[PDB]
């Protein structure tokens, strides 16, 4: 038995969750129970907290998706068959260079893109506020909100900060499945190969490293789950043989190890540094460094 999938599922009264300082009035009712999910993790869905910040976020979120969707349907001649076969090829492009950073572009030539970006901007930041508040209501630390900022950073640099510093919305990313891939490839071409951007290489080390570390941590916990290993919070407060065997596996393997609490500090930074270094690398491209190959020759 490897404990990858549960052998027997057990169920009881729906769990409504801790109260603490949260406004119980904004909490929805319990959702259905999924036996399918129950084989892998919890079977219970909901309840969810739906305050004003969340409603606003969901609203802009939908408007963003709607704005893109209406442009795609327009590109499809309002033909369902065409909409589906060309779905990955449609693209909502930003204003042309001639428009700079103005909001003058006509709807079909950058205006819809600007609207789409406004809705996305509001959706993401309102959601970020939500991650902070939900932690505050339960008296928890703000580690989730902080980590989320790192991801927000790359996004901000790509569609707002860099375009603004470059002087035009045309520098931003289009909304499209294949189009945004073309944009990514072109971005490297235009800046003399990103493999030469030092921050791009670091970002890769952390992306690889996150898969490396989570495979390591996930496998470790499962390996000591026979000693209640996943109850990490209590293992932190009162170390057990699960924590000891886990630490010793690694100390005997690579000469050093972590603690039940400390491993989660290694984890959060490993992931967070992915977009932190990534954002810096992109922000420097085109504003300070035009060609990384050339740059590399002088450093």
């Amino acid at each position: 038995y490897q404990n990858i999938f549960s052998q027997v599922q057990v169920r009881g009264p729906a769990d409504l969750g801790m109260t603490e300082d949260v406004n119980l009035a904004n909490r929805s009712g319990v959702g259905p129970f999924s036996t399918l999910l129950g084989w892998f993790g919890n079977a219970q869905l909901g309840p969810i907290y739906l305050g004003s910040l969340g409603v606003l976020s969901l609203f802009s979120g939908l408007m963003w998706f709607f704005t893109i969707g209406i442009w795609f349907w327009y590109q499809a001649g309002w033909n369902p068959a065409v909409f589906l076969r060309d779905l990955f090829f449609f693209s909502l492009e930003p204003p042309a260079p001639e428009y700079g950073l103005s909001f003058a572009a006509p709807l079909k030539e950058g205006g819809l893109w600007l609207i789409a970006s406004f809705f996305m901007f509001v959706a993401v930041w309102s959601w970020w506020g939500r991650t902070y508040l939900r932690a505050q209501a339960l008296g928890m630390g703000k580690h989730t909100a902080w980590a989320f900022l790192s991801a927000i950073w790359l996004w901000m640099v790509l569609g707002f900060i860099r375009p603004i510093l470059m002087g035009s919305w045309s520098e931003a990313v289009p909304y499209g499945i294949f189009s945004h891939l073309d944009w990514t490839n072109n971005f490297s071409l235009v800046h003399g190969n990103l493999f030469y951007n030092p921050f791009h290489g670091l970002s890769i080390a952390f992306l690889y490293g996150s898969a490396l570390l989570f495979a390591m941590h996930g496998a470790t916990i499962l390996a000591v789950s026979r000693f209640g290993g996943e109850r990490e919070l209590e293992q932190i407060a009162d170390r057990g043989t699960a924590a000891e065997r886990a630490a010793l596996f690694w100390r005997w393997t690579m000469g050093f190890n972590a603690t039940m609490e400390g491993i989660h500090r290694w984890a959060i930074w490993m992931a967070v540094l992915v977009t932190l270094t990534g954002g810096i690398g992109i922000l420097l491209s085109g504003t300070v460094v035009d060609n990384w190959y050339v740059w590399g020759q002088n450093h």
């Binding site: 490897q2 404990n3 990858i4 769990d15 969750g17 801790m18 949260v22 909490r27 892998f40 993790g41 919890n42 869905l45 909901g46 309840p47 969810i48 907290y49 065409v82 589906l84 076969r85 060309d86 990955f88 090829f89 505050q136 008296g139 928890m140 630390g141 580690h143 980590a147 989320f148 294949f178 992306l207 898969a211 490396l212 989570f214 390591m216 941590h217 996930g218 496998a219 470790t220 499962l222 390996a223 996943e230 990490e232 919070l233 932190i236 000891e244 065997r245 010793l248 596996f249 100390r251 393997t253 000469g255 609490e261 500090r265 984890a267 959060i268 490993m270 992931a271 967070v272 992915v274």
Partner: protein, 281 residues
Amino acid sequence: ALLSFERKYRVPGGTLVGGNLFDFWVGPFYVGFFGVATFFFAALGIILIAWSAVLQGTWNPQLISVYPPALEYGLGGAPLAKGGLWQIITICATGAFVSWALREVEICRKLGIGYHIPFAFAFAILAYLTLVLFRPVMMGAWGYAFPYGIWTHLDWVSNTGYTYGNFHYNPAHMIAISFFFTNALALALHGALVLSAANPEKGKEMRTPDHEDTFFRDLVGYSIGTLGIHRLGLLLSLSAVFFSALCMIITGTIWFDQWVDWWQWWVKLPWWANIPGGING
């Protein structure tokens, strides 16, 4: 030196080979038969690389590079200076990686824990082997493998990719990337949640797992659970590597042209292939 709770665990037994011959430690490192095997392989490999550096004429870490046999050599052997050295070093690397895994297994047995870790690591090894062994062989030549050099291997990645246009269009590659991104997302989430619960607002008591399920339930309407999150992290990581190996194994063996063209099968579907309008109409 030992950790203050270590003694009771440094017990005999667990080895897969050599009985108690290599059953001992050196500082914090456990040895075992596979401990010495790893050392052997790693040393020989590093030595052969240093020799290849000499034949190349440099000691610069940024310049040293060992290339495999040129396409002319097919799947046969080659002169130590023209692909042969890479070939031996590849054997040593494989021997060292596998030995490292098997050493991890002995350590698992001695501690009475599961074998998940070495199992996970095997996925990494299998990814390496795909680029350096399985794909080259299926393609018919060792030349298709990548060179061992800090920057030279990046050139190989670039040239290999552009041989098929923009590699982004490789469907298996897309799935692999999704797994890498989602994994990093999950890793950040797990780290932050545990820490946010163990380190609540200054002056408050340690939160419980209940607070963790509640936080995410409040946030997205679903909580995977303390056991599931670890199960997920392992799955995403391995799936990312699994699909990496798959996206490459098929390139140059069953797919030869520009990856972007592969998507025509979807656009050319009978019921909408010829309908005018749209991007492809």
